[PDB]
Amino acid sequence: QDPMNSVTVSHAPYTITYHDDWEPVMSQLVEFYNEVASWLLRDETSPIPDKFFIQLKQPLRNKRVCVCGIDPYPKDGTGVPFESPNFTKKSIKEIASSISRLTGVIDYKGYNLNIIDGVIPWNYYLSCKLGETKSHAIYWDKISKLLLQHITKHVSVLYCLGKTDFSNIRAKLESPVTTIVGYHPAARDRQFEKDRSFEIINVLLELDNKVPINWAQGFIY
Amino acid sequence: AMASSADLTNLKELLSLYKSLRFSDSAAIEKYNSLVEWGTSTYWKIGVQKV
C-alpha cells in the first residue's frame, strides 16, 4: 500500500496501481495508454478494463523468470496471465500436466504460475477483443515493448510460448536477455507435451548462478 | 530448436563442464567453448563465457 502507488489515465480503468519496481516506466505507460485506450475500449475485452494492469502490482526485483504468452485468454481473462481460477483453460491444464510429469506430483486441483516464487507470468498484449486472439496487437504494440523490456531488466530468463507468435521477439527487446521460445500448449501433434522448457529454464538459471524455479509450488490442492 | 530434449542435454553438459572448469585436454576445453557459443546463439545471452 506504501510499496504500491497509483497514476491516473484518461480512459478506463482511469487509475493504474503499481508496485514500486515499475516506477521507471509509469510516465510513458500513461502517455501511451491515453493515446490508444478509447479505440481499445470500443470492444468488449478479455480481461475487463479494470483488470488490464493488475499484474503491475507484482514486484520485479525478486523475479528470475518471465513466462510469457502473446495475449490473454480470448475469454475469461482475469488480468493475471495464464490464470484460470477454476482450472478450466486448456493451456493451464497442459502446463500443469507437464509440471506433474516433471515433479511427480499426480493429485492436484489447480495450477497457477503466479504463486511460484521467482516467476512473473506475462501477457505480451494486455487485452484482446472477446473471442479473438491478437485482435488488439496494433493498440498494445508500444506499451508491450515498454513493459517487456522493463521486465527483462530484472529476470534472468524469458520463456515465450508460441513459436509463431514470438518468432520475432528479439527485435522487440533492446538489451539481450536469455530467451527461450517454445511451443504453445495448443500446438499441433502434442508438441508442447515433448517440450522441456521448464527444465531448460532451470539449467539456464544455474548457468547464471541463480536459484532454479520450484515449479511444484504452482500446484493448488 | 530452443526447447527440445536435445537442447536440455547440451545445456546440462555445459553446466557440468562449467562446474568443473578444470580441463585436462584440448577436447574438453573446445567442447566447453563451442557449447557456450551454441547456447549464446540459441538463447541470445547465457550466464557463462568462453575461457
Numbering used by the authors:
A (entry chain B): -2 to 218
B (entry chain D): 0 to 50
Task: Provide the publication's sentences verbatim.
His-D4/A201–50-WT as well as His-D4/A201–50-T2A (carrying a Thr to Ala point mutation at position 2) crystallized at pH 8.7 in space group P3121 with unit-cell parameters a = b = 92.6, c = 145.9 Å. Diffraction data were collected up to 1.85 Å for His-D4/A201–50-T2A and to 2.2 Å for the wild type complex. The structure of A201–50-WT is almost identical to the one of A201–50-T2A: the effect of the mutation is strictly local and affects only the mutated residue. Two His-D4/A201–50 complexes are present per asymmetric unit. The loop connecting the two helices (residues 20 to 27), which is not involved in the D4/A201–50 interface shows some variability when the two complexes of the asymmetric unit are compared (data not shown). When this connector region is excluded from a superposition, the Cα atoms of the two complexes present in the asymmetric unit can be superimposed with 0.29 Å rms deviation. In A20, two stretches of residues form the contact surface: residues 1 to 14 are located in the loop structure at the extremity of the fragment and within the 1st helix; residues 40 to 47 are located at the end of the 2nd helix and in the following loop structure. Likewise, in D4 two stretches of residues form the contact surface: residues 167–180 and 191–206 that are present within loop structures, a β-strand and a α-helix. In addition to the flat interaction surface, the D4/A20 interaction uses steric complementarity forming a tongue and groove connection involving residues Arg167 and Pro173 on D4 (the “groove”) and Trp43 on A20 (the “tongue”). The crystal structure of His-D4/A201–50 highlights the importance of several Leu residues (Leu7, Leu10 and Leu14) of A20 for interaction with D4.
